[PDB]
Design goal:
The first copy, chain A, is of the alpha/beta class and 184 residues long. Chain A is 36% helix and 29% strand. The complex binds ligand IG2 (6 copies) and manganese (II) ion (MN) (12 copies). It is classed as lyase.
């Protein structure tokens, strides 16, 4: 089983993260940000990873520094879990709906970081969560993990539906790229 | 008296609902969402139904899952109260103002679900309540009850006035369609 | 083997339907509408289902009531064949060409009905079949089965080619979503 | 193992080609055109075919006649390797990135030739290779093999990145369509 | 060492301020406004001033009166610390980035107050802090200190990044203008 | 003296690089690309670094793979030379002309990679060198070194003048950011 780990402490935040790439979908996510915990459960449920996050930070300023440090920690742990990368599929591709929304995702585990982001989120807040932090989460994840990632919206109107469909399609495309390629 | 009931429990919410179609306007509505309780009182007061709702949920994420599960429960209870549908008017139609706002409603108790929605709500929050949830409430209600519904705005500026006039006109059109047609 | 059945008789039509989700591609389709029989054979041939339809109706008015009642019967039989839905893939996705035409399909077996339809069919009749009935067929199927469905055109000019490519891509995406997920 | 062969000699060129559809990714490509050799290596590496090309021609006029005759020879050898086409998947579909570029490919091994081409290459030369020859290569390949092919660009800026991503996505979609379908 | 002081009490607020122009970067900032404390720490860290603020006010109306009175107090203390202004550089100029944002600042310690402000902040709230108060802060500071100030945005998208880059560039330009000019 | 080193060998290229941050302007640059050697001499001459590059590659395809691998090696060696980064200026800023051209540069040695690129180069080739490789050079350098970089054109017409003025302004801004800050 490919298991990666990371711990990071600064003057703003304290973060611990653990990821299993050959899991059964166990989730235990307790950051300081309740809506982000709901999205990280989708990564376990539709990708079948084991995911565990614990974090405390400076949320009386805002949620920005806690959102950034958690995303950096997940990228580092994924790069440690993958290792040599011998014998994997390496590419993944999927489109996923939630009622009237639909999002398309493709990625490549290349060693070269890049983000292409093309979403149109029509409100500024979902509950207490700020909607500019969705794009900042994915940009910090690709910088520490070294992946090429493209995200593109086909339709949708409700803001809760659009974000949750992104995290569903991302989970299924990442599951495809990390599985072993039994050859032709 | 035509009385319908429903109870639904999931990992997000716990909901109980009871509706009387031949009532005197008794209201007892205690969801977790205070502005939605104020709108459900209009359904009892202007339609003369008896309406009772009790709900608890996961409102520290947001109000979305609690708003959706309550609406599904009301649609199921209405379909159980109606039964065979022998001898009713079946169609209803009404327009209702509140100061400078005016909304037109027509519906048909057909067995075929459809929503046509045409409102223009100019702010994002009324009190703590999110304004995209008005359209999600009516879409969940027509899917479990099987009704054809059309809603169209003629004028209006204040957001509180526009939503409360929708729930007034809906109540008077539903009262017309469920009453017995003493024949010509 | 997951097998679903339905019989419906009204003052307009008489319909019998049977579907096997673990089939070998046996087709026996005899509605009153010859072009619709040719499309239902594609569902058996490219999805590997067993499909059987028998229908008579009031085709001297037009084909509308017979087209609607057959589609409702197929949705009910699919919902009975699926049952609990334990252990399936649940999502499906595919794009299919026929000469110069190309159509993209994605779906989710959710319990929440919705149709997104985006085709541009350039003539009014193919043989004797009316081209507005393509959209009415898919809307009746999602209302009884409870599925989320999105259909989108990428290119194409000939009307026979565009409709037949829709039914090919739909068959391959439905085969993906009903198969058992041997886990990671 | 399905192996196809072809030899063609005219007053312009001399060409020999050999392809294995059940290979391990062995490449030995020596045409007179160095950039085209680099693209043919991608077909072996990402599709897992065995590919061997040897060619000499009249490259002091230009590269046009050598580029056309090699493409015709590959189409003939693929049609000989496939034979009866009993029991294959027959359809294939994939999207592939390279940094900021992304291209979508779908195809069908039908017996009816057609090309849909939609790329936007922003310079006239990559090294010594002329960029109008990319479209001429794919048009000659579909005429001798008899396949339906669609190619469409989603993003990209660098000319080397756009062409190499086309040959990657084409390789993965062709691998899907030639594999045996173990039935449902 | 050039040290300036100020105390101001009204029926709205109570404010105490102390600034050292020849400091080592010691910060002790406790206003009633948490996001403004985070920006005042940047003034100590990148300009190497010693800065100390203590304030209480009427924040149950809003943050406006507390934001205005703190800014007036800082301008007065800077004018007392500078004194005669013999032998200083008097002018300062700097451009500073933070990820995708970039802001240009130039100023002159002239005795004539003026503000030129050209920022485009795309949301209304960062955490609890209102974004119209950024411009009101700088206008009150130049009126009591008597400085000419110009602020201009070159790029940027995230609201937290744009404001924090303004306070970084302002700190480095003010450090340049208050240092002693060892002559040519 | 802060000295960094790197050696990288792949199936495309062979590269060796050495950089001194406290140098006297000694240059010894022998890649396979003659115009790129002329630009690397500007980095020694105007920034006062010592720079040494040796490379061989696959330039009969094109110059792309050799241009990319050299840029990656320089970024790694700079990150090794900097180390802890205690006591440096960390920011740099400069604008530089060459006849009718003028380019503005600012950067920050942050640990977070980002490139903003805004040039308009009016021809496709300068000598034998391809002009799309200027942007690819700077993107590979910021990914291995972890710097924030912004480049913006103010005027210019001749292609040789525009590129050489970029490399002059970059050299003077990097010299500023790596020097020791004798404190205030
Ligand atoms: O079981 P699902 O994966 O379909 O989860 C849907 C839930 O009800 C909830 O996550 C949701 C419903 N609408 C937005 N979010
Ligand atoms: O008695 P009414 O039905 O007219 O209720 C009006 C109330 O004052 C209140 O519901 C309201 C007034 N304006 C918006 N809402
Ligand atoms: O064998 P296929 O699946 O390619 O069927 C094609 C048939 O010839 C026919 O269905 C058709 C050809 N053009 C439109 N329809
Ligand atoms: O190993 P890869 O498949 O990612 O090959 C990338 C190579 O470095 C090279 O083919 C390339 C890099 N950029 C354009 N071409
Ligand atoms: O050390 P820095 O000056 O780069 O501070 C950056 C911090 O992480 C934080 O202030 C920040 C990061 N993004 C916005 N704010
Ligand atoms: O001495 P300089 O730095 O001005 O170098 C100018 C040279 O003549 C040469 O590099 C040049 C002149 N025009 C373009 N390049
Ligand atoms: Mn940030
Ligand atoms: Mn949800
Ligand atoms: Mn919902
Ligand atoms: Mn009211
Ligand atoms: Mn109808
Ligand atoms: Mn046909
Ligand atoms: Mn030709
Ligand atoms: Mn290449
Ligand atoms: Mn004021
Ligand atoms: Mn910050
Ligand atoms: Mn490259
Ligand atoms: Mn020169």
């Amino acid at each position: 089983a490919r298991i990666g780990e990371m711990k990071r402490v600064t003057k703003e935040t304290n973060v611990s993260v653990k990821i299993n790439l050959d899991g059964t979908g166990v989730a235990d996510n307790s950051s300081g940000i309740p809506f982000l915990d709901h999205m990280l459960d989708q990564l376990a449920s539709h990708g079948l990873f084991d995911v565990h996050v614990k974090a405390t930070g400076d949320t009386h300023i805002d949620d920005h520094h806690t959102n950034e440090d958690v995303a950096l920690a997940i990228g580092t742990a994924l790069l440690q879990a993958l290792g040599d990368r011998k014998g994997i599929n390496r590419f993944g591709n999927f489109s996923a709906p939630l009622d009237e929304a639909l999002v398309h995702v493709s990625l490549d585990l290349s060693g070269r970081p890049h983000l292409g982001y093309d979403l149109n989120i029509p409100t500024q807040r979902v509950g207490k969560y700020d909607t500019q932090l969705v794009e900042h989460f994915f940009q910090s994840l690709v910088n520490t993990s070294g992946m090429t990632l493209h995200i593109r919206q086909f339709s949708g109107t409700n803001s809760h539906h659009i974000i949750e469909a992104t995290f569903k399609a991302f989970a299924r495309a990442l599951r495809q790229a990390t599985e072993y390629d039994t050859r032709r």
